[PDB]
Amino acid sequence: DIEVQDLEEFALRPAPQGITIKCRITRDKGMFPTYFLHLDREDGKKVFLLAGRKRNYLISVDPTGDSYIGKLRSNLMGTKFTVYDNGVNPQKASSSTLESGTLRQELAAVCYEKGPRKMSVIVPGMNMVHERVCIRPRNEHETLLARWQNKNTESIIELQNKTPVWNDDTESYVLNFHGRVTQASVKNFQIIHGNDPDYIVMQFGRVAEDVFTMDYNYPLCALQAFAIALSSFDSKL
Numbered sequence: 001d002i003e004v005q006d007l008e009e010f011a012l013r014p015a016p017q018g019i020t021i022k023c024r025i026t027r028d029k030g031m032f033p034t035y036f037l038h039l040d041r042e043d044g045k046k047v048f049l050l051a052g053r054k055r056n057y058l059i060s061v062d063p064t065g066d067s068y069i070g071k072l073r074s075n076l077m078g079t080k081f082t083v084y085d086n087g088v089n090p091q092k093a094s095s096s097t098l099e100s101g102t103l104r105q106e107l108a109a110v111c112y113e114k115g116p117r118k119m120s121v122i123v124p125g126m127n128m129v130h131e132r133v134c135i136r137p138r139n140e141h142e143t144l145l146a147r148w149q150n151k152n153t154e155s156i157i158e159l160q161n162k163t164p165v166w167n168d169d170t171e172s173y174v175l176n177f178h179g180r181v182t183q184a185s186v187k188n189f190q191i192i193h194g195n196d197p198d199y200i201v202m203q204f205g206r207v208a209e210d211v212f213t214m215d216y217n218y219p220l221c222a223l224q225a226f227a228i229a230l231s232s233f234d235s236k237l
């Protein structure tokens with residue numbers, strides 16, 4: 001019965017050891033769609049966790065604008081995404097902030113590149129106590145996408161979508177969601193680490209017109225996973 005008291009603290013809290021946090025994203029109720037993330041208690045009740053809405057998507061723990069704990073930035077193309085916390089943008093930072101207290105953190109970055117298409121998820125590395133090693137870029141070469149491209153693999157973690165395999169009976173590339181043949185698309189995917197395709201860090205799939213299921217494990221927290229999933233709504237595909 002994973003505890004959820006402080007919504008902001010929960011949002012930023014990495015998934016525990018051998019525990020999978022299972023959630024459900026529900027879409028809505030010009031003006032942009034509002035996605036709601038709820039914890040799927042295994043006893044039957046839902047616990048609100050986060051609300052995300054395009055305006056860049058602002059992710060907040062307050063459903064009832066511009067107050068947020070997370071922010072999702074996309075490129076013009078919809079192929080490069082970066083998730084920030086609610087800290088100070090280094091470009092607008094004052095001398096006092098820059099070298100005395102601190103700037104905005106980068107919680108995640110996503111890149112949607114014959115075979116099945118690739119999806120790259122870059123997150124902050126974890127320390128020896130298994131807690132995110134805060135990445136607060138003071139410039140362009142310190143971001144998650146820049147480190148990823150420059151191969152500064154030290155404090156980061158390179159994840160990717162699990163490769164779906166062609167199924168002869170379905171005549172479609174498929175993924176296996178808990179044993180069930182699932183049609184691979186930008187709406188149904190799993191995030192793993194190349195070196196270990198058996199460990200599902202994140203599993204996202206649609207279960208209705210406006211309903212999807214999202215499960216996540218270590219090192220991810222609800223804010224990263226939720227933001228990764230929103231990037232799939234906003235992507236080129």
Ligand SMILES: O=C(CO)COP(=O)(O)OC1[C@H](O)[C@H](O)[C@@H](OP(=O)(O)O)[C@H](OP(=O)(O)O)[C@H]1O
Pocket residue numbers: 056057058066071072073074084086087088089090091092
């Ligand atoms: O520094 C402040 C933190 O206290 C706010 O950051 P700052 O980036 O300087 O000021 C903002 C810029 O116009 C930025 O381009 C926006 O999105 P982008 O970050 O995706 O490029 C950001 O949107 P918002 O983060 O509120 O959704 C704005 O607030």
